[PDB]
Structure formats: C-alpha cells, structure tokens
Structure 1
Amino acid sequence: NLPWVEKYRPQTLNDLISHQDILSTIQKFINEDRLPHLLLYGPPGTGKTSTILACAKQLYKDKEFGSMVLELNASDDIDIIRGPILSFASTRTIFKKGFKLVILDEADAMTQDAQNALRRVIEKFTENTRFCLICNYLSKIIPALQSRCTRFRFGPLTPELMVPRLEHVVEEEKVDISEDGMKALVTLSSGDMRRALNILQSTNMAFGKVTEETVYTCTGHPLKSDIANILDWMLNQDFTTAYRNITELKTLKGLALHDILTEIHLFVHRVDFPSSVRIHLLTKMADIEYRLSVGTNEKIQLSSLIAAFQVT
C-alpha cells in the first residue's frame, strides 16, 4: 500500500534529524528574512528535498504554493533557464508580496552553459526570487554558480541518530525485528534513511520478519560467510582447486567479480597480514578492478585475483 518512505516523512522542520546545526541556521534565516540562495549537496536519502519542502511550507501557505514555488527537476533537460525559470523569476505574482522560491532538484545534471545562464539569472533577480539548488556531487557544479550561494553538506546519518527513528517506526508499525536485524539493516542502508526504511518495509512485506539473514536474502547482498569461504579458498588451497571452488560459488549464487573484490578488500583490511603483504594484495586488487572496468573476460580476471593472493 502506502510506502513507509512517505508515511513517516518529517512534516515540520524540527522532525528532521542529524542536521541540527544546518536546520537551526536555516530557521534563523527564515525568521530574519535573510534567506540566501541555498545549495544543498550530499549523498542520497539524507533529507534535502524534505528540508527545503518543510522550509517552504513554513514560508508560504498551501494555496500560495502553486504560484510562488517552482519545483523543477534539472534532469529532464540552456532553454530551461531562459524559458520557465527566467519567466518565473522576473515576474511578480499579482497580489502576493514577498520573494519566490525556485527548487532545482538534481542541479548537477546541468550542462556548464546552462549553469552560466542560471548564474546570471540568479545574480540579476536576487530580491524577488530565491534559488535552492540540490545536488549529490558539488564537484559537478561550476565554481562560478556555487560561489553565488551558501553551501550545505548533508552528509550521511550516523547509525546512533538514525536508530531511534527506526525504533519509532517499528513500534508504531508491527515489525518483529531482531537485535541484529536492526544492525544488518543499518549496515546495508549505509546511512540514507530512505534506503533503510525501503529495505525494512520490503523485507517485512515479503518474508514477514526481519533478521540478519532475511535482509541479506531480500537484498541479495553477498553474505559475510561466503566471502570468508572465498578468502579461505584463495589463502589455504591449491591454485586450481581454488579456481574451481570460487567459480562454482560464483555461479551458484548470482555473484559478479566487482562485489567479490569489494568484500575481499574489506576482509584484507580486517584479517591480520604482515602489513607488507597487504600492500601487494591492495595494489593487485586495485588493478583488477580497473581491468574489469573496461569490459574484459571475468574468467581471466578471477584467475588474476587468485594469482594476487598466491603471494602467500
């Protein structure tokens, strides 16, 4: 039915979590009519399009929200700048007094010429239309454009902050969550509340109970024991019987070499090596990843990885 990523949206500005400094500064901006152009950037699912929407609903009303807020996605399309944006920023709204708000979601998919045009539009109409850009890679935004507006990095949510909200969601709903299912959910989410709530809802709706095994099977994430097995084949076996074992496991479950390689890197850093061997393992694994990035055979790259581990 209704997804939990929408039912538990923070409707106000204080229901946001883990960004108390940024939220307090934006609230102070609102109180003093000093709201500058904002550039909210960071990893997905961290609360950007919710922060600015709460700020808007606090700033305008619900009927002024169609004629004084231009929610525009930048991934649909230089014409979008001199088109609707320049025609929205330059004109007043008839009876309403106050600035307007333009919300450019995915503001980093814009070509550089479009960002030049938009920077001039911003610079011109800066007292009747406040722009709020939203992106994931501030490096993709022209330094010129970013200079114009104050920047806010919405980093990922630490697991201490985000666990109470998940506990409130669990208690409000009826989810029999284990003491580690929460841990295997926080880990797999990797710090974006959207993915955490989505995974939780989908697994609870598919299997009926969340634990450290059910979430790992619902998301198809390679289990830790399997990667331990692969590292053991590589580290304590013959070359050919390791190739055979690893290939059989890699085809048994759906498993590529990118994921094997990532988890094996984490394990190389986990387990104890003479610290002059992991310099070799790390170098070779970072070369195998580049080799795989160009569309090569995985039957020769897997063998190269086993060769890398055969320094032992």
Structure 2
Amino acid sequence: NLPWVEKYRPQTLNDLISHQDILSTIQKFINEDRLPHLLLYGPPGTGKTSTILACAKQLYKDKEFGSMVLELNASDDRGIDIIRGPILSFASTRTIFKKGFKLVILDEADAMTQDAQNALRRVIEKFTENTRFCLICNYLSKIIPALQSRCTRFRFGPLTPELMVPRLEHVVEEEKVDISEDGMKALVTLSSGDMRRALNILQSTNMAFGKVTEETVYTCTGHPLKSDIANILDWMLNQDFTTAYRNITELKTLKGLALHDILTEIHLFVHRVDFPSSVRIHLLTKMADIEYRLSVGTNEKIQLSSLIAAFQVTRDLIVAEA
C-alpha cells in the first residue's frame, strides 16, 4: 500500500522524541508568538521536516496551510534566481487570512552558495514581522556566519538506541512481524541513529523475507558481516602475504565487498583489538592514507596489498614484542 514512514509520520509535539528540550522551547516560543527564523540542522532522518510540519499544523489549520506555508526543496535549484524569484515575492506580501506571519520551509539549505546565502540574508533581514523562515540543513558549516547570526539554530541530533527501541517496539506491536533480539540489535546498529532508515529497513525485511533476524537484515542490506571482517583481519594478522592476498581477493570477488567498506569496518575493529599504542598509530596513519588513496581513484588491488602490508609489518612488530 504505502511505506511505513508515510503511514506513521508523527503529527504531534509529543509524538516526536529525544528533542524534548527543543520541542519545549519551540512550544514556549509559539505560545507567546515570539518564534524567530529557524535553522534546524543535523543528520538525515532525525525529525527535521516533521517537527516543523507539526509546528505549522499547530499554528495553522488544514485550510490555510497551503496558503501561508511555501515549501521549497531539492527539486528546486538553489542559486540566485530563486532568492530574487518566488521566495522574495512570497515573503514580501500580506495575506487576507488572520494576522499572523508567513512560513517558508526551505529543505536542504546547506546547498546554497555564499552569494545565495547573502541574498537570503538580505531577504530575511528585510522582512521579519510578516515572514518567519525555516532553513533545514545537514551541515551547519556549509552556510555563512551572517546567516547563522540572523536565524536561531537548533541541533537535531541522532536518536539514542535506548530511546529509539520503544518506537520500534510500537511499530512491531502494531505490525505483526517476527522480532528477535539480534534483529533489533542489527536495526539499531545499521540504522545509525535515525528512524527513517530503521523503518525503511524494517519494512524491506518484512516485504522481502517475512521475518526480522540479524542475518535477514544483513542479507537484505548487504552490510559487511562481523565474522567476515574478523576473517579478513585474521588473514591479515596470521597468514603469509600471498595467502592473505589471494584469500581476501577471493572474498572480495565472492561476497561483493569493496575496499572502502573493508577499511571502515577494519577501522572499527582495530580499536577493539588491544594493540600497543605505536603500532596503533602506524595502523591508523596507514589506513587513513589508504582511504585517501582510494578517494583519489587509483587501482584497488595495490591498495589492498598496502593494507595487508601495514598489517604484516604490524604482525612482525607484535610477534617481535612478544
């Protein structure tokens, strides 16, 4: 029928969670008619659009939501023609409706250039009493400090799994699918603290297989397995160079892994492996260099051999220290 995010989107200030100080301050400002221009910034899928849509439906009714709220998003290119186009003409006009300010929801405001953000700074500072902007963005640092200096910012952080699991339990009680502990651990680990990807992965696991366990999530998503990276690190740490190179290139051409994902999972693994500090520094410097060398677009086998090379120098130093 419909995706679960479009079915169970929150519509109330209490239905959005972990932002209780932010939502309390927004409710405090909006009961006293003191709401400023808003700048909601954070990771994707943490409740940026739905919070301001809940606040808009609190402020305005269903009939006047389409009139006193203008929404611009990624479908609109954000250059200099837009800021002298529809958003200026929208902000510089009155309405035949009740005497309240307008609202402009500008999705992905970090994609505006410095000239575009300065023109938007002119538009924001020119019209304040009749228009209250809402710029929502991923990176705060991609916008100018003047724009940060005229609109109040709010950091929509990620959702802690301790607070994330009651909503997952609610959506697994409402929608009857098979739930285990390792499936929920895979959900709250692979989702990376945002509800949108957790609900999408849960719905895709329901529609693809039917049950939600750890290996079903891993096979539906393609995330590297923990025992897979354990085998990669074991081959790098206690095998010969040609043996490890052949084993890891067969695992790469079999499992569909890539060297960037191997690099980040090995980077997460080597801070669990209790190395001495010096060989930890050597491994981290070498792996960051391999990440940059893969970023600049070189051959992949040679960088794989350099990763095995760093771990072979590591294993020589570890045995020599033993």
Alpha-carbon distance between aligned partners in 2 of 1:6 and 1:150, rounded to the nearest angstrom = 29
Q: Where does the alignment leave 5 or more consecutive residues of structure 1 unmatched?
A: none
Paired residues of 1:46 and 1:156 also in contact (CA < 8 A): yes
Alpha-carbon distance between aligned partners in 2 of 1:293 and 1:240, rounded to the nearest angstrom = 25
Alpha-carbon distance between aligned partners in 2 of 1:249 and 1:66, rounded to the nearest angstrom = 54
Q: What is the CA deviation profile of residues 184-227 of structure 1, one whole-angstrom value per residue up to 9, with x for unaligned ones? A: 11000000100001001101110110101100110000100010
Q: CA deviation at 1:95?
A: 3.7
Secondary structure of 2:270's counterpart equals helix
- Which deviates further from its counterpart, 281-290 or 71-80? 71-80
Structure 1 pair 95–184 and aligned structure 2 pair: CA distance change class (3 A) = closer
Residue 235 of structure 1 corresponds to 237
Paired residues of 1:122 and 1:131 also in contact (CA < 8 A): yes
- Which deviates further from its counterpart, 107-116 or 36-45? 107-116
Secondary structure of 1:39's counterpart equals strand
Q: From 230, 249, 252, give the equivalent of 1:250.
A: 252
Paired residues of 1:74 and 1:107 also in contact (CA < 8 A): no
Work out the percentage of aligned pairs sharing the same amino acid: 100
Q: What is the CA deviation profile of residues 123-178 of structure 1, one whole-angstrom value per residue up to 9, with x for unaligned ones? A: 01100010010000000011111110111000100001110000000001101111
Paired residues of 1:38 and 1:131 also in contact (CA < 8 A): yes
TM-score normalized by structure 1? 0.98
Alpha-carbon distance between aligned partners in 1 of 2:76 and 2:312, rounded to the nearest angstrom = 50
Alpha-carbon distance between aligned partners in 1 of 2:296 and 2:311, rounded to the nearest angstrom = 22
Q: CA deviation at 1:273?
A: 1.2
Alpha-carbon distance between aligned partners in 1 of 2:75 and 2:174, rounded to the nearest angstrom = 36
Alpha-carbon distance between aligned partners in 1 of 2:239 and 2:217, rounded to the nearest angstrom = 31
Q: CA deviation at 1:256?
A: 0.8
Paired residues of 1:200 and 1:210 also in contact (CA < 8 A): yes
Q: What is the CA deviation profile of residues 11-60 of structure 1, one whole-angstrom value per residue up to 9, with x for unaligned ones? A: 11111000100000000111000000000000000001000000000001
Structure 1 pair 184–95 and aligned structure 2 pair: CA distance change class (3 A) = closer
Q: Number of residues paired by the alignment?
A: 312
Structure 1 pair 74–92 and aligned structure 2 pair: CA distance change class (3 A) = farther
Residue 33 of structure 2 corresponds to 33
Q: CA deviation at 1:75?
A: 5.6
Q: What is the CA deviation profile of residues 230-269 of structure 1, one whole-angstrom value per residue up to 9, with x for unaligned ones? A: 1000000000000000000010011110000111111111
Paired residues of 1:75 and 1:106 also in contact (CA < 8 A): no
RMSD: 0.9
Residue 124 of structure 1 corresponds to 126
Alpha-carbon distance between aligned partners in 2 of 1:292 and 1:182, rounded to the nearest angstrom = 33
Q: CA deviation at 1:69?
A: 0.5
Q: CA deviation at 1:275?
A: 2.3
- The list of structure 1 runs, each at least 4 consecutive aligned residues, that deviate by more than 3 angstroms after superposition, is none
Alpha-carbon distance between aligned partners in 2 of 1:296 and 1:95, rounded to the nearest angstrom = 60
Residue 16 of structure 2 corresponds to 16
Alpha-carbon distance between aligned partners in 2 of 1:102 and 1:233, rounded to the nearest angstrom = 55
Paired residues of 1:75 and 1:109 also in contact (CA < 8 A): no
Structure 1 pair 272–57 and aligned structure 2 pair: CA distance change class (3 A) = same
Alpha-carbon distance between aligned partners in 2 of 1:105 and 1:264, rounded to the nearest angstrom = 35
Q: CA deviation at 1:76?
A: 2.1
Secondary structure of 2:86's counterpart equals helix
- Which deviates further from its counterpart, 248-257 or 271-280? 271-280
Alpha-carbon distance between aligned partners in 2 of 1:232 and 1:74, rounded to the nearest angstrom = 45
Alpha-carbon distance between aligned partners in 1 of 2:261 and 2:55, rounded to the nearest angstrom = 40
Q: From 197, 200, 203, give the equivalent of 2:199.
A: 197
Q: CA deviation at 1:94?
A: 2.1
Q: Where does the alignment leave 5 or more consecutive residues of structure 2 unmatched?
A: 315-322
Q: CA deviation at 1:74?
A: 5.3
Paired residues of 1:99 and 1:127 also in contact (CA < 8 A): yes
Secondary structure of 2:168's counterpart equals helix
Structure 1 pair 227–74 and aligned structure 2 pair: CA distance change class (3 A) = closer
- Which deviates further from its counterpart, 44-53 or 278-287? 278-287
Paired residues of 1:70 and 1:103 also in contact (CA < 8 A): yes
- Which deviates further from its counterpart, 94-103 or 197-206? 94-103
Paired residues of 1:45 and 1:194 also in contact (CA < 8 A): yes
Paired residues of 1:74 and 1:110 also in contact (CA < 8 A): no
Paired residues of 1:39 and 1:132 also in contact (CA < 8 A): yes
Alpha-carbon distance between aligned partners in 2 of 1:72 and 1:244, rounded to the nearest angstrom = 52
